[PDB]
């Protein structure tokens, strides 16, 4: 179609995409021109039924969703699959009158391609919505990292750790599950490495905050280092989370 974005989308569309790619070449080479195509009334009727149910359930979502971007990006896919379906239905009609109909064959290839393209669009639009759910979790952590600098007491720090810790565990789970699904290895590597770095820095962040909190009135030398270490760690963690957010939205070709 060519390459699909996730292993789930791949598992759904890859077989029919390959079958259509072969059909396209067959048609380009005139391989189906010579023989009568049998009545496709039944198989086309099944496609029509599947299209109606797809669009029905898709339309339900468009008015049963809070998601504003999902609202606008989904409808064009219904129109595409609808168009494709009219060609398939028309081809079946033509073939009933004349199994050697050339226009019918053009409708078969273009309709099959249209079904694939529209369904691909639909699944990506849902996928994009799922990625937005992951990014909102990442942005939550980004925001909570900005208020590390306001922590001044041990009870502030304990509260901060108890809030940030689980948030990080949730993000880690989402990124780990997401990377496993990606079809592009380069992107998996970036997500894994970034998440690994974020996990490494968490205890480094808390260590520096603890020194500051426990020694702020001493005034050591360790205080200045604790402030610098905290600031630098927050900066580096934030950069890695922003990289995760970037990679989640790529892309390829």
């Amino acid at each position: 179609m060519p390459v699909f974005h996730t292993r789930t989308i791949e598992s759904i569309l890859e077989p029919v995409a390959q079958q259509i790619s072969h059909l396209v070449i067959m048609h380009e080479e005139g391989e189906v021109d010579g023989k009568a195509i049998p009545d496709l009334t039944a198989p086309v009727s099944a496609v029509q039924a599947a299209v109606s149910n797809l669009v029905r359930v898709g339309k339900e979502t468009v008015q049963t969703t809070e998601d504003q971007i999902l609202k606008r990006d989904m409808p064009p896919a219904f129109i595409k699959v609808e168009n494709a379906c009219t060609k398939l239905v028309r081809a079946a009609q033509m073939l009933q009158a004349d199994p050697y109909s050339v226009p019918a064959r053009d409708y078969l290839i273009d309709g099959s391609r249209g079904i694939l393209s529209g369904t691909s669009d639909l699944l990506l639009t849902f996928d994009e919505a799922e990625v937005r759910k992951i990014i909102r979790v990442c942005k939550g952590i980004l925001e909570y990292l900005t208020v590390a600098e306001v922590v001044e007491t041990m009870e502030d720090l304990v509260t901060y750790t108890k809030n940030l810790g689980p948030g990080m565990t949730k993000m880690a789970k989402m990124i780990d599950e997401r990377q496993q699904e990606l079809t592009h290895q380069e992107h998996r590597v970036m997500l894994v490495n970034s998440m690994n770095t974020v996990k490494e820095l968490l205890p480094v962040l808390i260590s520096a905050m603890k020194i500051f909190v426990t020694t702020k009135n001493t005034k050591s030398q360790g205080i200045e280092e604790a402030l610098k270490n905290r600031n630098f760690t927050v900066e580096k963690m934030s950069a890695e989370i922003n990289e995760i957010i970037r990679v989640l939205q790529l892309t390829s070709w």
Partner: peptide
């Protein structure tokens, strides 16, 4: 997930394409 409806449409399309080639 609209995976149920997508899989059904993909399989129905596969059946169609197979019938054309047969």
């Amino acid at each position: 997930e609209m995976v149920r409806q997508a899989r059904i449409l993909a399989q129905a399309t596969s059946d169609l394409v197979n019938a054309i080639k047969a």
